[PDB]
Each structure stands twice: as C-alpha cells, then as structure tokens.
Amino acid sequence: SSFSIYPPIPGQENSLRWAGKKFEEIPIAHIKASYNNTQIQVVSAAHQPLAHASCGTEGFRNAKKGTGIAAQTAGIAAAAKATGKGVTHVRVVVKGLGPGRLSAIKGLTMGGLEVISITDNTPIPHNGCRPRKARRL
Amino acid sequence: VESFASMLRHSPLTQMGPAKNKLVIGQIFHIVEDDLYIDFGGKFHCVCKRPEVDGEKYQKGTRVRLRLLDLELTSRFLGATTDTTILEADAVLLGLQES
Amino acid sequence: SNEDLPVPMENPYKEPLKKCILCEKHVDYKNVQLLSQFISPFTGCIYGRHITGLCGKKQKEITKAIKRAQILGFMPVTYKDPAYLKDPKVCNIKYRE
Amino acid sequence: QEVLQLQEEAKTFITRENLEARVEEALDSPKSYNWAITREGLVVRPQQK
Amino acid sequence: PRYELALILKAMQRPETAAALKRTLEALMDRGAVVRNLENLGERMLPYKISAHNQRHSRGGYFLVDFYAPATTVESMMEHLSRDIDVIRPNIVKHPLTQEVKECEGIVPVPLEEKLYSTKKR
Amino acid sequence: ANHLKFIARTVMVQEGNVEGAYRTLNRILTMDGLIEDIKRRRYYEKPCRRRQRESYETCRRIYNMEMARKINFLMRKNRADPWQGC
Amino acid sequence: QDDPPPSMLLLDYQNVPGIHKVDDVVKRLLSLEMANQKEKLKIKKMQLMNKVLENPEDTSSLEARIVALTVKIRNYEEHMQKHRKDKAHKRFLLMSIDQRKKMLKNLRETNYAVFE
Amino acid sequence: ATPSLRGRLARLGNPRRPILKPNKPLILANHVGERRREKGEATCITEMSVMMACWKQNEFRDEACRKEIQDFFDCASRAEAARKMRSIQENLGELGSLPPKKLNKLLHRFPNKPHV
RNA sequence: AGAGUUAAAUUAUAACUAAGCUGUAAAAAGCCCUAGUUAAAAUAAAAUAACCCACGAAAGUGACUCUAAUAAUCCUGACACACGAUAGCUAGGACCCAAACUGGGAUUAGAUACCCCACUAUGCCUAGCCCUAAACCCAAAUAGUUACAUAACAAAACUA
Ligand SMILES: [Mg+2]
Ligand SMILES: [Mg+2]
Ligand SMILES: [Mg+2]
Ligand SMILES: [Mg+2]
Ligand SMILES: [Mg+2]
Ligand SMILES: [Mg+2]
Ligand SMILES: [Mg+2]
Ligand SMILES: [Mg+2]
Ligand SMILES: [Mg+2]
Ligand SMILES: [Mg+2]
Numbered sequence: 001s002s003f004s005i006y007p008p009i010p011g012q013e014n015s016l017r018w019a020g021k022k023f024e025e026i027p028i029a030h031i032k033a034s035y036n037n038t039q040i041q042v043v044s045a046a047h048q049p050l051a052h053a054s055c056g057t058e059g060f061r062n063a064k065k066g067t068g069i070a071a072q073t074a075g076i077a078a079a080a081k082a083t084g085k086g087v088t089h090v091r092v093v094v095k096g097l098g099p100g101r102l103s104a105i106k107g108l109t110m111g112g113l114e115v116i117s118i119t120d121n122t123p124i125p126h127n128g129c130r131p132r133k134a135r136r137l
Numbered sequence: 138v139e140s141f142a143s144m145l146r147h148s149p150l151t152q153m154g155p156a157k158n159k160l161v162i163g164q165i166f167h168i169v170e171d172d173l174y175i176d177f178g179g180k181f182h183c184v185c186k187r188p189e190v191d192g193e194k195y196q197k198g199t200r201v202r203l204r205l206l207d208l209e210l211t212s213r214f215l216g217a218t219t220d221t222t223i224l225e226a227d228a229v230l231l232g233l234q235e236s
Numbered sequence: 237s238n239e240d241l242p243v244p245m246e247n248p249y250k251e252p253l254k255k256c257i258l259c260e261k262h263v264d265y266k267n268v269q270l271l272s273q274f275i276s277p278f279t280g281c282i283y284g285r286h287i288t289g290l291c292g293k294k295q296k297e298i299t300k301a302i303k304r305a306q307i308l309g310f311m312p313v314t315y316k317d318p319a320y321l322k323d324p325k326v327c328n329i330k331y332r333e
Numbered sequence: 334q335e336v337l338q339l340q341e342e343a344k345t346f347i348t349r350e351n352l353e354a355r356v357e358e359a360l361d362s363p364k365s366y367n368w369a370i371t372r373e374g375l376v377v378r379p380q381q382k
Numbered sequence: 383p384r385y386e387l388a389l390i391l392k393a394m395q396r397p398e399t400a401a402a403l404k405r406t407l408e409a410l411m412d413r414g415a416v417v418r419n420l421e422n423l424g425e426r427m428l429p430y431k432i433s434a435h436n437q438r439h440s441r442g443g444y445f446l447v448d449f450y451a452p453a454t455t456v457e458s459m460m461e462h463l464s465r466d467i468d469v470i471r472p473n474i475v476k477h478p479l480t481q482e483v484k485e486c487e488g489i490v491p492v493p494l495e496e497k498l499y500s501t502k503k504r
Numbered sequence: 505a506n507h508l509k510f511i512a513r514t515v516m517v518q519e520g521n522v523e524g525a526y527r528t529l530n531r532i533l534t535m536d537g538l539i540e541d542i543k544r545r546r547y548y549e550k551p552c553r554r555r556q557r558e559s560y561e562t563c564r565r566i567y568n569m570e571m572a573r574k575i576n577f578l579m580r581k582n583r584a585d586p587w588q589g590c
Numbered sequence: 591q592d593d594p595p596p597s598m599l600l601l602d603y604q605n606v607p608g609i610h611k612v613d614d615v616v617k618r619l620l621s622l623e624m625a626n627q628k629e630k631l632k633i634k635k636m637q638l639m640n641k642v643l644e645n646p647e648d649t650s651s652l653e654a655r656i657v658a659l660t661v662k663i664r665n666y667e668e669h670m671q672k673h674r675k676d677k678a679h680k681r682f683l684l685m686s687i688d689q690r691k692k693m694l695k696n697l698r699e700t701n702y703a704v705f706e
Numbered sequence: 707a708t709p710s711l712r713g714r715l716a717r718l719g720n721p722r723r724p725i726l727k728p729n730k731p732l733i734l735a736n737h738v739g740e741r742r743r744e745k746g747e748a749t750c751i752t753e754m755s756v757m758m759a760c761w762k763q764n765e766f767r768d769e770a771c772r773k774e775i776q777d778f779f780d781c782a783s784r785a786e787a788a789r790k791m792r793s794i795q796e797n798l799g800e801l802g803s804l805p806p807k808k809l810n811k812l813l814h815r816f817p818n819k820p821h822v
Numbered sequence: 823a824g825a826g827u828u829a830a831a832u833u834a835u836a837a838c839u840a841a842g843c844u845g846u847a848a849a850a851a852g853c854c855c856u857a858g859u860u861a862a863a864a865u866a867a868a869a870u871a872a873c874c875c876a877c878g879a880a881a882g883u884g885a886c887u888c889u890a891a892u893a894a895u896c897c898u899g900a901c902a903c904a905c906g907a908u909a910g911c912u913a914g915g916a917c918c919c920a921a922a923c924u925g926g927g928a929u930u931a932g933a934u935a936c937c938c939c940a941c942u943a944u945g946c947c948u949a950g951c952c953c954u955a956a957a958c959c960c961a962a963a964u965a966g967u968u969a970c971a972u973a974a975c976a977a978a979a980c981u982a
C-alpha cells in the first residue's frame with residue numbers, strides 16, 4: 001500500500017480512478033473561509049458552478065454566521081445541492097483562514113460528499129498591496 | 138628521583154591522548170537498581186545502564202570494557218562565567234572483561 | 237635540563253573542519269534539479285541554515301541562485317517540480333509524523 | 334598560458350561560415366546541467382536513466 | 383566565456399527555430415560580439431504561463447549562448463531581443479565560469495559569545 | 505495564477521480520512537510559517553514594530569535553545585541518588 | 591582628453607611574447623574593446639605615470655599618489671557627467687580632490703621643483 | 707542549533723549597529739517557567755451532532771434512534787474518565803519531559819554563575 | 823546612481839451561479855453596478871530564504887539582470903564644502919492599495935477618540951526646495967591595557 005500525499009499531476013502516467021473518473025475531471029469545491037463568513041461553491045472540472053451555499057444564504061445573521069456551525073450547515077447544504085446534480089467525489093480548495101475552516105470541510109462529509117484531496121489556496125501577497133492599519137491604537 | 142614531567146610523559150593517560158572512541162577497562166564500585174557506577178579510572182566515574190544480556194552477572198567489583206566518549210562533561214551557557222561540570226563522564230558498555 | 241618537558245608545538249590531534257554538502261562545489265542557476273532539493277515541495281519556501289546545514293557561503297549562494305532561477309523562467313516559485321520531487325532528501329525537516 | 338588557452342578556443346568559436354553548422358548541431362545535441370547531491374556529499378546525475 | 387544569454391524561444395517547428403537562432407546570432411555578431419558556443423537545453427514545459435507579445439505561452443525552448451561582448455552593447459542586445467516576437471524572455475547575465483570557485487573552507491566552529499554582561503551578583 | 509493548479513499545498517487523503525488530512529496540511533503550513541505570516545498580514549505592521557518583533561523573537565529563541573540544551577545536558581543527573589543519608 | 595585605442599592590447603596581455611603573431615580574434619578579445627572601465631583606468635594610470643613621473647617603480651611617492659588620485663578624479667568627473675543625482679560619487683570626487691590638494695600642499699612644502 | 711550571539715548586542719567593543727535589543731538581560735535563570743494551563747476544549751461535539759440529527763430528522767423522539775443516544779453517553783463517560791485520570795497521570799509523569807517541580811530542583815543543583 | 827524585467831496578491835474589464843457582500847464582543851451604517859469561480863493590463867510594494875549581520879561617512883539598503891563604482895602608503899580638526907529618514911511645498915505625470923482631514927454608523931451624560939464604512943491631501947515617478955527626529959546604540963575621533971579598582975542601575979573599569 002504505497003500511498004503518497006503528493007497530488008497526481010496529469011503529466012505523469014499514474015492510474016488512480018474515483019468513480020471511473022481521473023483526478024483532472026473530479027469537481028472542485030471552493031471554500032472561502034473568512035473571519036465573518038464562509039462561502040462554499042461547487043464547480044465542475046469545466047469551471048461550471050454546480051452548487052453554491054454560504055452561511056449568509058443559510059438564514060443566519062451578522063454574528064450568527066461567524067461560528068463554525070454556520071460553516072457546517074453551509075457545507076451540508078452545498079453537499080445536498082451537489083448530490084442533487086449527481087456528484088460523488090470532489091476536491092476541496094480552502095481559501096483564507098477563519099473559524100469555519102475545518103467545519104466547512106467536514107460539512108461536505110456530513111452532507112454526503114467524499115473528500116479525496118484538500119488544497120490550501122490562501123492568498124499570500126509577496127509584500128504587495130498595503131493592508132489596513134492595526135487596530136487598538 | 139623521578140620527576141613529575143618524566144612520570145607524566147609515561148603516564149597511561151598521556152599515551153591515550155584524546156578520549157574520543159577509546160577502549161578502556163573499568164571497574165564497577167557502586168550498584169543501583171538500574172544504574173551502574175563504573176570507574177574507568179581516568180578522573181571521574183561514568184554511569185551506565187544494565188543491559189538485557191547477562192544482567193545478573195554485573196556485581197560490585199566487576200571489571201567491564203568501555204568505549205570512552207568524553208573524559209568530563211562541561212559546557213558553557215548564557216551568562217555563565219565558567220563551565221557547568223557534570224561531575225561524571227560519558228561512556229558506553231560493550232562487554233565485561235572478555236578474557 | 238629535563239628532556240621530558242612539553243614542547244610548544246601545534247596540536248597533532250586537530251580534527252578536520254566539517255564541510256558543507258556543497259563545500260568546494262559549483263552552484264549554478266540552471267540546475268533546477270539541484271535547486272529544488274532545498275525548497276519545500278508543498279509551499280516552495282527556501283530552507284534556512286538550521287534545515288540545510290551549509291557553511292556561510294553556500295547558503296547565500298544557493299539563495300541567490302534560486303531567486304535568479306525563479307525569475308529567469310527555469311524553476312517554479314509556488315511549488316517544486318514533480319519531476320525533481322523524487323530526488324534524494326538532503327534537508328533535515330520532516331512534515332508527516 | 335592564458336593566451337595559448339584562448340588560442341585553442343578560437344578554433345571552436347562560432348563565425349559566419351560555421352553558423353549554419355552550429356545551429357543544426359545545437360538543434361540535435363541537447364545539453365543538461367541538472368545534477369543532485371546526497372547527504373554524504375556525492376554528486377549524482379540522471380543521465381544514467 | 384564572458385556573457386551568457388538564456389534565450390527562451392517560443393515552441394515552434396525545427397526550421398523556424400533554426401531561422402530564429404540564425405538571426406539572433408547574426409544580430410549578436412553585428413553588435414561586435416563573437417559567440418563562443420551554442421548549447422541547447424531542450425524544449426521543456428515552462429514553470430509558469432508567460433505572457434509576452436500579446437501571447438499566452440505554455441511551452442518554450444531553452445538555449446544557452448555564451449559569448450564575449452563589450453560592456454556597452456549589453457543594453458543594445460537587450461533592447462533588440464525585447465522586440466523579438468519569437469523570444470519569450472531574453473536574459474543576459476555574467477557567465478558562471480568567469481567567477482572562480484573560491485575555497486569553501488567549511489563550518490568554522492563559532493564559540494559562544496562571553497563577557498556581554500558584568501560580573502554583578504544578582 | 506500563472507502556475508499550474510492543484511500542485512502546491514495539496515494533500516491527498518487516504519481511505520477517506522479527512523480529519524487527519526486537515527491536520528497534516530495544517531502541520532505543513534505551520535512548519536512552513538504560512539499560518540503566522542497570514543495572521544501577521546491581516547493588519548499592516550510598521551518597520552519599527554517589525555524590528556522589535558524580530559529582535560524579541562530572536563532573543564526568545566536563543567534563550568529557549570540554551571535552556572533546552574542545558575536541560576538535555578543535565579538530564580543525566582535525574583537518576584535516583586545513591587548517596588542518600590550521607 | 592586621452593583617447594586609448596580599443597585595440598590597445600591591455601597591460602595584462604601586452605608584456606608577454608607572441609601577442610602580435612596570433613590571429614585577429616585573440617587580439618580583439620585581449621584588447622580594450624572587450625575590456626571594462628577598470629582596465630582602461632589601469633591603462634590611463636600607466637600611460638600617465640610613464641610620462642609625468644620620473645621613477646615609475648616608486649609608487650609610495652607623493653607624486654605617484656597624486657597621479658593615481660588624479661586618474662580617479664578624472665574617472666569620477668566622467669561618472670558625474672552622466673549621473674547628476676548621484677551624491678555618493680559626488681562626495682567621493684570632492685574628498686578625492688581635497689586629498690589631492692592636501693598632497694599638493696605637502697609636495698610644495700617638501701620638493702618645490704617636483705610640485706611645479 | 708543555537709543562533710549566533712557575536713556582534714548582536716550594543717557594547718563598547720562592538721563597532722557595528724546592535725542587532726538584538728534584549729528586553730531583559732540574557733542570563734540563564736535557575737528555574738524554568740511553569741507549564742501554562744492547557745485550556746480544556748469541548749468534547750463529544752461530533753457525537754452530539756449525530757445525536758441531534760436523530761432529533762431533527764425524527765421530530766425529537768428517542769424511540770426512533772437509540773445508538774446515537776447511547777454512544778453520546780459513552781463519549782461523555784469516557785471524557786469524564788479522561789478528565790479525572792489524566793489530570794493526575796500527566797502531572798505525575800510527562801514521559802520525555804520532566805515536571806517543572808523536578809526541573810527546578812535539577813537546575814538548582816547545577817545553577818548558572820553570573821558572578822565571579 | 824542609471825537602463826531593462828516581473829513570482830504572489832489586488833484591481834479596471836467579460837462569462838456562469840446566488841441573493842446577499844463587507845462589517846464587529848454585539849450591532850448599525852455602507853454596497854445589493856454585490857458576492858464566488860474562470861481569464862486580465864497599469865500602478866504600488868518587493869512572502870520563505872533572514873536562527874543570515876553584510877554594504878554605505880551618516881541617514882539608509884536585502885525581487886532579478888547589466889553598466890559606472892564604493893577617497894586617502896589611511897592622526898585630530900570648523901561657523902567652510904557636500905549629504906542628510908519620514909513629514910511638508912512647487913510644476914508635470916501616475917493612483918491598485920493604505921490613509922491625515924472630512925462625511926456617515928456604534929459606545930459614551932458628553933466622544934468633534936479608541937470600534938466599522940466611504941473619500942482627500944499624502945505615501946509613487948521627474949526636476950526644484952525645506953534641512954527636522956527618542957538623527958539614541960542617549961556611550962566623540964585616533965592607537966592602546968586588564969594594572970589600581972564595584973555611589974546605584976545600565977553596556978566593566980581605564981590610558982596618551
Ligand atoms: Mg501615538
Ligand atoms: Mg559601517
Ligand atoms: Mg528596558
Ligand atoms: Mg531617477
Ligand atoms: Mg501577476
Ligand atoms: Mg486605471
Ligand atoms: Mg443596513
Ligand atoms: Mg520579494
Ligand atoms: Mg576606502
Ligand atoms: Mg580628517
């Protein structure tokens with residue numbers, strides 16, 4: 001059972017299949033986990049949005065959507081909407097650091113989606129645009 | 138009358154030179170439940186652990202073989218004028234007077 | 237009059253100084269395979285001295301070569317090339333535990 | 334010695350007459366500078382594959 | 383070798399690569415420089431998608447051009463190569479062989495710094 | 505953006521294990537220093553504060569390394585005292 | 591202003607035998623055409639010392655130091671004619687001029703004919 | 707390894723600009739810091755979620771699903787046992803590391819020498 | 823000091839999906855020409871390497887390449903000469919982003935403050951000024967010593 005955590009880059013001749021599809025055809029689930037909200041959008045390999053569900057759309061409120069349960073419910077709703085269109089495996093791409101980071105990821109599993117790979121795509125500027133000033137002057 | 142320099146030049150420690158990876162013969166003078174105080178004879182006494190093989194054969198006065206690592210463990214730290222002597226030596230157990 | 241007195245001579249037991257892995261070597265900006273061994277496969281960070289173990293010159297030379305290659309178009313910045321991913325491990329950093 | 338060393342290299346330089354031959358020779362003779370290292374300090378090359 | 387040119391040409395056919403190399407070397411010789419050798423590094427996948435000449439390039443051929451040129455024509459060669467549509471990214475640097483490999487002496491043991499504070503009793 | 509996707513910071517789960525895959529990815533990020541950098545870049549820090557933070561971190565790291573080295577050196581003397589009652 | 595030929599066959603490859611027997615490529619590579627500004631500075635210093643000084647071997651002499659600093663002063667003026675906003679090189683040129691003036695005063699106080 | 711300290715502080719013999727500015731003098735103390743209390747985290751959250759799933763799906767009745775009710779109690783009992791026994795076991799032994807009470811006494815045996 | 827280049831992020835700009843996005847301890851205001859994904863110039867800045875301590879007289883400098891180049895056969899020495907962070911002024915250009923000020927939203931008895939949103943001068947480039955800092959490492963420059971000797975703290979005491 002030689003298993004490597006590195007992704008199966010299409011340039012190689014690897015033979016790994018999930019539900020009969022290759023790694024390049026498996027849909028993507030972008031989870032933007034902000035400090036006040038968590039937006040989950042399920043798109044296909046052709047970059048076609050299939051399921052979209054966020055904490056704000058889940059009937060929450062200003063401070064109600066900042067908790068991890070909001071991310072879990074948004075993930076459950078996104079998983080239900082994606083399974084309504086007939087998907088089994090999905091690749092989770094996490095964007096940003098927030099309280100609802102792992103809760104949103106586990107929400108898909110709770111709602112009935114299998115996670116095969118987790119990719120951390122967090123915007124890291126190489127000292128680009130100047131961010132806002134520090135709080136608590 | 139033999140001189141101190143003359144006897145030091147012929148001392149076994151002078152012939153040994155560096156204390157790195159040198160085979161020496163020591164004699165155990167104190168016994169603990171799991172630790173053995175072996176006096177290799179240079180300056181201090183090293184502390185070793187009783188091995189699983191022939192553990193009962195290690196008694197007080199038993200002679201053993203050692204591979205000496207350091208003659209005296211001293212090191213410097215932050216704000217320390219002098220070194221921190223461990224009052225011991227670093228050595229490992231190989232056998233018990235194989236003859 | 238004593239012939240057994242110590243003589244002020246050099247130390248005969250002086251051990252050779254430890255060398256960096258690239259000691260007396262040539263570092264280049266075109267050997268992407270060599271340059272990738274010092275970068276993280278997942279993030280692409282350049283490992284420091286405590287991870288690599290290089291003496292004072294080669295660490296800076298490797299850093300400069302990596303920075304030059306990342307901009308000249310020879311080595312990716314965001315990740316390590318999967319072609320060179322199967323290279324022998326020279327760093328002393330372990331991620332998976 | 335430097336002048337003599339450069340004299341030998343002057344024969345292999347690229348000129349107007351040798352431009353066409355050198356272009357074709359380069360287009361058919363690839364070169365690689367990739368070589369890795371080990372913990373012992375020995376060089377390894379992928380050309381043995 | 384004095385200067386080194388890392389020529390990233392657009393991935394094209396064999397005759398077009400030959401013509402591009404011929405004209406690039408002719409332009410380099412016209413500026414007063416003699417080309418020492420021409421080394422081809424092969425056609426590899428580009429590390430990143432390079433945008434040049436209003437074209438998105440995913441592949442490219444690498445070439446190594448070592449030559450001797452005066453210090454005044456480096457900018458003229460750079461400007462000439464900047465406007466070439468068949469060049470993805472031209473770069474002129476100093477050849478690595480002109481810098482002698484000095485003696486990498488090794489890891490000299492640096493002792494712990496002392497006498498940074500007074501002997502006052504705490 | 506210009507680089508190929510699903511290559512950097514990508515962890516493949518094994519046997520459907522997601523909780524441990526997330527922990528492995530977080531350990532990757534912490535050891536690469538991405539978590540601290542992201543938390544620091546949320547609000548801009550002035551160079552005067554950056555120099556103070558760097559100096560404080562360097563001093564703390566040196567002190568911790570020296571304390572750990574001394575603890576490891578003195579670990580030998582943790583054995584039971586054979587000369588009790590002397 | 592001095593006009594060093596681009597084909598001067600600079601000093602590092604000038605006193606060795608067999609320089610004129612090789613083909614044109616070797617001479618062109620070993621000449622000032624492919625050289626940097628430091629080689630031209632060395633050539634100018636050698637040419638100025640061979641004509642102004644009386645003992646080219648006496649480098650520690652005040653006149654030799656004055657000639658060496660004059661070469662650097664001319665180079666700094668040439669650099670300044672191109673770079674107007676460069677302040678470090680302007681400071682270098684001004685302090686080199688001050689040092690040359692101090693050495694000229696010392697030479698005038700010590701040996702008047704050499705100073706003149 | 708330990709980062710270098712030469713040329714870091716501001717001293718009379720140091721010619722360069724100081725690199726490190728110590729908040730307090732870098733003297734190795736004779737006692738280590740006491741282990742900061744590891745704030746306890748909520749347990750059996752996953753078990754409670756699947757327990758409340760039965761209530762949400764079956765309109766809040768325990769007669770529909772029973773295993774999701776019994777496993778929640780088992781998790782609560784295991785968490786209580788872990789809170790009780792480990793709070794003593796970890797304070798008694800820390801495997802590789804030593805307790806701070808033993809570390810302080812060990813350091814007092816071989817303290818630092820700032821003076822003399 | 824000049825010339826050339828951009829790896830990440832961000833944005834003007836188009837396409838699919840949703841009614842929400844941002845915002846805090848909690849809210850409100852603001853934006854719903856909004857948000858998520860796929861592509862995308864210009865401007866600004868230059869993650870890790872840096873646990874490195876180098877260059878420069880100082881201020882200051884660490885994305886890359888090329889050119890010029892870093893005084894003194896080396897004492898101290900001005901009111902003379904030349905520089906001199908950020909902030910500010912003038913003329914032109916640029917403006918993603920941040921933000922004085924200002925206008926709204928919270929808390930406050932009051933809040934013309936600390937919390938949130940929008941925006942200006944400004945931070946950017948060229949040329950010309952202003953010549954100020956906790957310009958501090960509060961320890962002057964040049965060649966030295968570990969002799970006598972702890973007001974206190976702090977970076978030990980001192981010579982010509
Ligand atoms: Mg203030
Ligand atoms: Mg300096
Ligand atoms: Mg203080
Ligand atoms: Mg300019
Ligand atoms: Mg970009
Ligand atoms: Mg615009
Ligand atoms: Mg509102
Ligand atoms: Mg950078
Ligand atoms: Mg100098
Ligand atoms: Mg002076």
Ligand SMILES: [Mg+2]
Nearest residue numbers: 912913914915
């Ligand atoms: Mg203006």
Ligand SMILES: [Mg+2]
Nearest residue numbers: 132133920921
């Ligand atoms: Mg703002």
Ligand SMILES: [Mg+2]
Nearest residue numbers: 925926927934
């Ligand atoms: Mg107001």
Ligand SMILES: [Mg+2]
Nearest residue numbers: 917942943944
């Ligand atoms: Mg503005």
Ligand SMILES: [Mg+2]
Nearest residue numbers: 909910944945
């Ligand atoms: Mg300004």
Ligand SMILES: [Mg+2]
Nearest residue numbers: 906907952953
């Ligand atoms: Mg100013």
Ligand SMILES: [Mg+2]
Nearest residue numbers: 881907957958
């Ligand atoms: Mg300052």
Ligand SMILES: [Mg+2]
Nearest residue numbers: 956957958960
């Ligand atoms: Mg003052």
Ligand SMILES: [Mg+2]
Nearest residue numbers: 898899962963
């Ligand atoms: Mg003075």
Ligand SMILES: [Zn+2]
Nearest residue numbers: 256259291486
């Ligand atoms: Zn080395």
